[PDB]
Amino acid sequence: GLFGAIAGFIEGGWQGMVDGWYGYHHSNEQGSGYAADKESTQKAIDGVTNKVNSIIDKMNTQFEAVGREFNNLERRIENLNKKMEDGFLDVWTYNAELLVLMENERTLDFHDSNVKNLYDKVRLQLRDNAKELGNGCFEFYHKCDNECMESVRNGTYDYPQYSEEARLKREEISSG
Amino acid sequence: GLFGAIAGFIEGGWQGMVDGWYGYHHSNEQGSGYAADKESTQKAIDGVTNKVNSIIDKMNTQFEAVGREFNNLERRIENLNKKMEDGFLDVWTYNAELLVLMENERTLDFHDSNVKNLYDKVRLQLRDNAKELGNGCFEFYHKCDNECMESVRNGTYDYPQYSEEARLKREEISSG
Amino acid sequence: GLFGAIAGFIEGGWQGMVDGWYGYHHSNEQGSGYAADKESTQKAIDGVTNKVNSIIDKMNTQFEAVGREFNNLERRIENLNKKMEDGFLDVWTYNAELLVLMENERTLDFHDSNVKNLYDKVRLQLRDNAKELGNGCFEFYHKCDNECMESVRNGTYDYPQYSEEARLKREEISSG
Amino acid sequence: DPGDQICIGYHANNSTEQVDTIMEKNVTVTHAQDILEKKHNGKLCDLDGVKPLILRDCSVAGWLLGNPMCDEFINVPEWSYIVEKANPVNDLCYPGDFNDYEELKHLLSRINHFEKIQIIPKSSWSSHEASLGVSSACPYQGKSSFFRNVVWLIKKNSTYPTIKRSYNNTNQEDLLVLWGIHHPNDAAEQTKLYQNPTTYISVGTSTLNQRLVPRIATRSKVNGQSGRMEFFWTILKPNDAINFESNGNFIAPEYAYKIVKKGDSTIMKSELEYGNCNTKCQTPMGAINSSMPFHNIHPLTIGECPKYVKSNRLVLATGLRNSP
Amino acid sequence: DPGDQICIGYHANNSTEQVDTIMEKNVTVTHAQDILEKKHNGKLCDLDGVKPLILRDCSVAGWLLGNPMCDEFINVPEWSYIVEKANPVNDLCYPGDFNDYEELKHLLSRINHFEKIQIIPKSSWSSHEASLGVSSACPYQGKSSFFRNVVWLIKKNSTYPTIKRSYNNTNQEDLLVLWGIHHPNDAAEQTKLYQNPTTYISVGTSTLNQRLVPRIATRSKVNGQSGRMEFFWTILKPNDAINFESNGNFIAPEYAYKIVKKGDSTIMKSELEYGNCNTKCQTPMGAINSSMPFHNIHPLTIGECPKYVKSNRLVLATGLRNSP
Amino acid sequence: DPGDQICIGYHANNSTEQVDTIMEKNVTVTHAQDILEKKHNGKLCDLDGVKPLILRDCSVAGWLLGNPMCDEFINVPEWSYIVEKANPVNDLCYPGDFNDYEELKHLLSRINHFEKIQIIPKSSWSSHEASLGVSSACPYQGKSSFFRNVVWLIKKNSTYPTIKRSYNNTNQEDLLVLWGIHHPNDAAEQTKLYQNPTTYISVGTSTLNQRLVPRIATRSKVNGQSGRMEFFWTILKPNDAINFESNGNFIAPEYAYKIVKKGDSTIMKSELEYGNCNTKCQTPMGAINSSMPFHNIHPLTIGECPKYVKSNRLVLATGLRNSP
Ligand SMILES: CC(=O)Nc1ccc2oc(-c3ccnc(C(=O)N4CCN([C@H](c5ccccc5)c5nnn(C)n5)CC4)c3)nc2c1
Ligand SMILES: CC(=O)Nc1ccc2oc(-c3ccnc(C(=O)N4CCN([C@H](c5ccccc5)c5nnn(C)n5)CC4)c3)nc2c1
Ligand SMILES: CC(=O)Nc1ccc2oc(-c3ccnc(C(=O)N4CCN([C@H](c5ccccc5)c5nnn(C)n5)CC4)c3)nc2c1
Ligand SMILES: *[C@@H]1O[C@H](CO)[C@@H](O[C@@H]2O[C@H](CO)[C@@H](O)[C@H](O)[C@H]2NC(C)=O)[C@H](O)[C@H]1NC(C)=O
Ligand SMILES: *[C@@H]1O[C@H](CO)[C@@H](O[C@@H]2O[C@H](CO)[C@@H](O)[C@H](O)[C@H]2NC(C)=O)[C@H](O)[C@H]1NC(C)=O
Ligand SMILES: *[C@@H]1O[C@H](CO)[C@@H](O[C@@H]2O[C@H](CO)[C@@H](O)[C@H](O)[C@H]2NC(C)=O)[C@H](O)[C@H]1NC(C)=O
Ligand SMILES: *[C@@H]1O[C@H](CO)[C@@H](O[C@@H]2O[C@H](CO)[C@@H](O)[C@H](O)[C@H]2NC(C)=O)[C@H](O)[C@H]1NC(C)=O
Ligand SMILES: *[C@@H]1O[C@H](CO)[C@@H](O[C@@H]2O[C@H](CO)[C@@H](O)[C@H](O)[C@H]2NC(C)=O)[C@H](O)[C@H]1NC(C)=O
Ligand SMILES: *[C@@H]1O[C@H](CO)[C@@H](O[C@@H]2O[C@H](CO)[C@@H](O)[C@H](O)[C@H]2NC(C)=O)[C@H](O)[C@H]1NC(C)=O
Ligand SMILES: *[C@@H]1O[C@H](CO)[C@@H](O)[C@H](O)[C@H]1NC(C)=O
Ligand SMILES: *[C@@H]1O[C@H](CO)[C@@H](O)[C@H](O)[C@H]1NC(C)=O
Ligand SMILES: *[C@@H]1O[C@H](CO)[C@@H](O)[C@H](O)[C@H]1NC(C)=O
Ligand SMILES: *[C@@H]1O[C@H](CO)[C@@H](O)[C@H](O)[C@H]1NC(C)=O
Ligand SMILES: *[C@@H]1O[C@H](CO)[C@@H](O)[C@H](O)[C@H]1NC(C)=O
Ligand SMILES: *[C@@H]1O[C@H](CO)[C@@H](O)[C@H](O)[C@H]1NC(C)=O
């Protein structure tokens, strides 16, 4: 993908996350589980809904072929009528098919972008209070209970609250 | 946005930066202020200027409707004339409207990309000589005066010059 | 570029890498050299091949002008015939030219994306076992021989195998 | 000891829906929306409750002139659209040509109902034979007949007095008026039927200024006849009158058509017949009942219809790339 | 102690300009460029200094034939474009039809100036009455008159000698030549006016081979007349001659039109009149003075114009997403 | 001590190929694919082995009627396409008009081969002079002649008996049949050539019902002649017959054209002649031999051709931005 997240550094999808397009898997002392990120999922739903409606509404005023008849000595204008109507049908078929191809590429890349941005949202929250394992996961240098996980998910993680405990774990690891 | 900078990890714009689209806010012992990044701003201006001119120039050779008259027993060819001219007007309206929608998406994402790349330009200059606060800002591990700020802005920051002072600050912090 | 790699944080191309679009330059005790990354190069070749064929095949069903003749008192329908045929030629010229402009932008950005993703692929493999110099290069905190370089190139680098040696080098450097 | 983890991921499912892009074909996605209608019921149906006029084996000309093999259509109710076969077998049973026929059919594209009315009764021809204009080329029930809406007039007592007749359109609606002229084989037939050697038919309205002359030629027998009938039409406006003068070869009006309802209609070429169904979108191959915005059934449609494309497949990705 | 900081950011302002995209509508941006012209001055104006021919209540036919209610147009200067109402009230004051009228108007689309010249003086008709061809259907100042550019010829002393006349186009320019034929009510009128029972009008050039015959029919009174006038035109090329022969029913030329300037022109349907303004782009609703590349005023324009679209709004983002 | 390094990079080369994008022009890339054909061999060539009919200085009418200056085309083999100059000098050597000429050329667009056959031998005219219908306007080798495929019939012993002739299309193929009528200058010439003052030509088939009358007018001399010839055509279907009757002014058929091969053809306007080459794609400016999908040579082509665009340049990037 253009943005390197989907089928990229996050190798595959989660069959176990059924209520959303993007989200989190957490693992702490209280247990483990999936939570869809509702905000990014909802922005994506709005985006794609607008895209489909825009595609249908732009194709609203397209050519409507009309039946016309000509006698045996009006062959020039019958042929003109035929190339005119077929010409417009070819134009609108091209527009429809191409718009679908281009917009499909953009939709797939849009999902990819959304996953990358959700990842970066967590990464820029946690900073050095967690270790980036390189596969979409972070390993916390401190204990992160369900309230802490929820704070990361909903964008209210408190880096200074844990920075001391995390710094102590980091120094412990970098000393051996 | 596709690139996660505008209204993303940089939460909002700067009403106080009036002379450019992208730039820097600095804060050091000599004071604080805004400076627009002229290079990235100028590339963006060139890009969008070319885009607008390209849109106008591609719409240069579009259909021009011509007045035609038919008598009471030429109703088939009058109708053909009507569907032909209306057909071309519908085609060119679709082209204009769609090209504007698609190019507007691309323009907004282009600005977003430019902000992300300006951020990464600074980040890859500073490396571990500064701390990434996660909101578009860097906190220097060393003193960075107006000449140092200017060196970061214009792409000539000297990482080895400050790497020792910065390393000493880092070790001081990671020791408590 | 949209993705900031080509002519971005990687300042220029490699005249010395002749067998591929993207790849690696390595430098270790066993010597130095260029290796094209065959997987990303091949995905790019497939992508662009499909794009060119799609462009040709979508232009398959375009208007074919037909010769028509009219006498001296059929000037209205001769003019109609002329504006009809010229109208379709203008439409298909616009489609061809625009599709080429838009797809050229996307192709250049596609290459840029591929370079960024190859970079991130290595970075997320190496993590803190190497230092990111900010110009597309990594400096290893441990010895990386030709088998190790090959393991980075083909996606099978073993971070835990070297994490101890690297940690010892890091601690040595951060102590002065 | 193993630290706590949080991971970012995306959805995968068992979906096998595929879409295409510029750079790649047959991309499996988690969700997609097909936007192309490809099916039809293969029947001719009512259009929002309004039945069509299905002419079966008759043509438009056979209908409006009153071909005796077309008595099914002597008075047809309001229609939504008209269905004509490619080569109806009941057309001009007496060979000839319909003047400006395609322009007339084009007017029919804008009409939903006719009220047939009598303008010149068959009995009011006192100087001319009105019940002798029959032919074996227009048979009815094994006996010679003719177009029911027009009257083939013949000489009476070896004389054909100058016909001077006029009709004033007192109706509040426009009137379609039909008549014709007979081109016989040779001078012997001309004298046989109309006495007068040189004849004409002058027709005039507020706008029409017509004078037809019977052309004589030796022609091939068509449905057993070498003479020809050339038919004509006009639209008599309200409070206007049409005037006929003729000393022979005159196929006079008897019935004319009152255009009671104008609207959106079409003439549809199809070999299908009535299907006893209802639809809001009709093609010559069958009716469409669909919420999708596009269809590829047939370009000529009527009703509330999807937009036609020549595509075999239009599928929009809505979800994301589905990993195996 | 708080370290020094450098931050990357982007511009925001107080702008409320909005644009649309595929995925989102009404996106406030810091900068935008409207590219759609939506206003016009609602007036008919000169086109780069050149005034239009505004025919007011006259039609093209009324102008070129010389309807006496159209003396305003006896000699019109060079025009940029022509403006005709939808249903001009001064057309064929004597009822009839103009032959190949739409093709003639089409030629007018390619002409900017006429020089009217006299080809057959009204006095040179010695065997025929030239000053009696007047009607009450073509009144002027309360007295009967006729089209000023053509001469309605009448019998003289109960005789109508064979007219044989020719005009040689000595001018270096093409010439528009107009004439006509009179279709009377009945034989009594034919004899009354032209004596000769059967008449004709043969017209010939290097390319024309015409022979018209007066058709007689009983028609509705239009502007008080049941006779009809059928008018004809041709383009006599330089160094070519036109020849007329006729023994009655002949509406002879008097004035013909020299095509002095060909160029780009059009016939514009509009009920507006002259506005005493100047413009480089004109529509039938009003003139456009605009630097924007598109407009939605009216598809039929003339001059240096933006490209027409049916859009209500075309706005390009130039700046970036404006945060609240 | 300097640690080991691995770097990510991209390809650069010495390429100067440039492409355009929406936001930037003249972007040097490492690889590109030109998709626009811009060259042609400037010659008229065979189309997949099949030579064209190149009419040189003759027109379609001059060919099919048998202009004596067009003996090169008395029997032309099967053609792929036809090439006609803009203003061929050998057209109607005797001035006149070809009826429905453009519709006939349109039929020619669908024909690849004619077999000329004799339908009415020149000798079988016993009551009429068949070898006297010659003119100096149609010279051959310095002597007066005429169109070779039609017979100008003249009175015999100051008498012109009623011609009644018929031809039955026994061939299994459709037949193009040509004839004509002569419009003389005045009554003296009419009597001189055909005796009978008033004449006609009635033509009838299964569908045709024609009756032509010679129009008399004083016309300008064209190629030395003031009389005119009006020519006519029809398509006689297999097992149909055509019937002619006439008492003068009749240009009778002699040869008719059997349509042996229908297919894809065109009439190409060009001043070029035969180039002794072969091609699969032909334009009026020259032939195209190209694998590229687009071309800008000329919109009117025949054969297996690229798609025409009005572009001066279509170049697709395939590689990436090439750094200096
Ligand atoms: C005539 C016509 O076809 N009109 C039309 C118009 C506009 C449309 O917009 C859409 C459309 C948009 C966006 N998404 C989905 C879609 O495919 N969805 C399936 C997945 N579903 C996810 C979803 C994701 C993963 C698992 C389960 C559900 C969801 N639902 N609710 N949430 C919070 N997330 C969202 C909707 C569908 N279809 C449209 C169809
Ligand atoms: C008929 C027609 O409309 N033709 C046409 C053609 C091409 C155009 O290109 C543009 C166009 C391009 C790029 N940008 C802006 C634009 O909106 N600007 C406003 C902001 N301004 C910023 C700017 C940004 C933020 C604050 C203040 C100024 C600037 N100016 N100077 N610098 C260094 N930066 C740049 C120009 C505008 N308009 C165009 C209009
Ligand atoms: C009528 C017509 O024109 N049809 C058509 C259709 C489809 C096409 O697809 C392409 C096309 C695709 C993708 N790439 C290249 C291209 O320009 N290449 C040159 C570079 N080359 C690189 C390459 C890159 C850098 C240096 C050397 C070679 C390569 N070759 N092999 N590998 C592993 N890498 C790839 C192919 C070219 N041309 C096409 C042309
Ligand atoms: C985001 O998650 C945090 C949990 O970490 C929620 O914080 C709690 O908010 C309530 C008020 O609604 C307080 O009374 C609690 O004390 C908070 N708990 C902690 C641990 O801070 C927060 O509400 C969540 N936000 C949303 C929108 O759900
Ligand atoms: C970029 O910023 C630096 C300031 O950090 C500028 O460096 C100075 O350059 C001048 C020459 O023009 C030297 O004489 C000074 O000694 C430099 N100062 C330092 C602290 O290095 C540099 O000129 C700036 N570049 C641009 C293009 O403005
Ligand atoms: C990727 O590179 C590594 C070298 O680091 C290759 O690993 C070797 O694989 C073979 C089996 O094919 C083993 O027998 C060797 O012991 C491996 N060497 C090491 C150092 O691990 C690996 O094969 C490469 N993969 C590909 C596809 O080329
Ligand atoms: C048809 O008959 C009506 C009356 O029976 C005629 O009505 C006149 O119409 C003309 C317009 O053509 C008006 O000027 C008169 O004022 C009407 N008179 C009346 C009493 O209504 C009508 O003229 C007749 N149609 C024709 C063609 O003569
Ligand atoms: C109109 O008059 C001119 C001379 O007054 C005639 O001029 C001749 O034109 C013909 C071509 O039609 C030339 O062949 C002659 O050489 C010309 N002669 C002269 C003296 O100029 C012209 O023919 C006349 N037009 C017609 C139709 O007869
Ligand atoms: C031409 O001649 C053939 C026989 O020489 C005629 O053939 C008949 O064609 C008609 C149809 O028009 C059939 O009904 C007959 O059965 C045919 N008879 C035979 C013996 O073949 C044909 O009619 C002639 N063409 C014309 C116009 O009379
Ligand atoms: C995509 O898959 C279909 C089968 O569903 C197949 O018929 C088609 O050929 C495939 N397209 C390509 C480009 O391989
Ligand atoms: C259209 O078809 C659906 C089945 O796909 C059916 O449920 C519905 O009733 C149909 N609509 C009408 C108006 O018959
Ligand atoms: C966008 O805003 C305008 C008001 O300026 C409003 O009329 C329109 O409905 C809005 N569009 C949508 C899709 O809400
Ligand atoms: C066009 O309008 C502008 C005002 O928008 C005015 O300043 C200008 O003078 C006008 N141009 C002409 C040629 O009248
Ligand atoms: C691009 O380069 C060509 C020369 O190859 C030049 O003629 C053209 O003007 C250039 N285009 C622009 C926009 O500068
Ligand atoms: C087409 O041109 C190429 C040279 O570009 C030549 O090699 C080839 O033989 C030509 N094809 C034919 C059929 O003449």
TrEMBL record, chains D, E, F:
What keywords is this UniProt entry annotated with? Clathrin- and caveolin-independent endocytosis of virus by host, Clathrin-mediated endocytosis of virus by host, Coiled coil, Disulfide bond, Fusion of virus membrane with host endosomal membrane, Fusion of virus membrane with host membrane, Glycoprotein, Hemagglutinin, Host cell membrane, Host membrane, Host-virus interaction, Lipoprotein, Membrane, Palmitate, Signal, Transmembrane, Transmembrane helix, Viral attachment to host cell, Viral envelope protein, Viral penetration into host cytoplasm, Virion, Virus endocytosis by host, Virus entry into host cell
State which stretch of the full-length protein is shown: 17 to 337 of 568
Q: What is the lineage of its organism?
A: Viruses, Riboviria, Orthornavirae, Negarnaviricota, Polyploviricotina
The record lists glycosylation at: N14, N26, N289
Task: List cellular component terms (GO).
Answer: host cell plasma membrane; membrane; viral envelope; virion membrane
Q: Name one GO biological process term.
A: viral budding from plasma membrane
- How does the protein's chain sit in the membrane according to the entry? Single-pass type I membrane protein
Tell me, in a sentence or two, what this protein's role is. Binds to sialic acid-containing receptors on the cell surface, bringing about the attachment of the virus particle to the cell. This attachment induces virion internalization of about two third of the virus particles through clathrin-dependent endocytosis and about one third through a clathrin- and caveolin-independent pathway. Plays a major role in the determination of host range restriction and virulence. Class I viral fusion protein. Binds to sialic acid-containing receptors on the cell surface, bringing about the attachment of the virus particle to the cell. This attachment induces virion internalization either through clathrin-dependent endocytosis or through clathrin- and caveolin-independent pathway. Plays a major role in the determination of host range restriction and virulence. Class I viral fusion protein. Responsible for penetration of the virus into the cell cytoplasm by mediating the fusion of the membrane of the endocytosed virus particle with the endosomal membrane.
Q: Where is the signal peptide?
A: none
Question: What's the family?
Answer: Belongs to the influenza viruses hemagglutinin family.
- Post-translational modification note: In natural infection, inactive HA is matured into HA1 and HA2 outside the cell by one or more trypsin-like, arginine-specific endoprotease secreted by the bronchial epithelial cells. One identified protease that may be involved in this process is secreted in lungs by club cells.
Which cystines does this chain contain? C45-C277, C58-C70, C93-C138, C281-C305
GO MF annotation list: host cell surface receptor binding
The subcellular localization recorded is: Host apical cell membrane; Virion membrane
Subunit-structure text: Homotrimer of disulfide-linked HA1-HA2.
* Disulfide bond found in the keyword field: yes
Q: Does the keyword Cell inner membrane apply?
A: no
Please give the superkingdom of this protein's source. Viruses
The protein's name is: Hemagglutinin
Its main localization is host cell
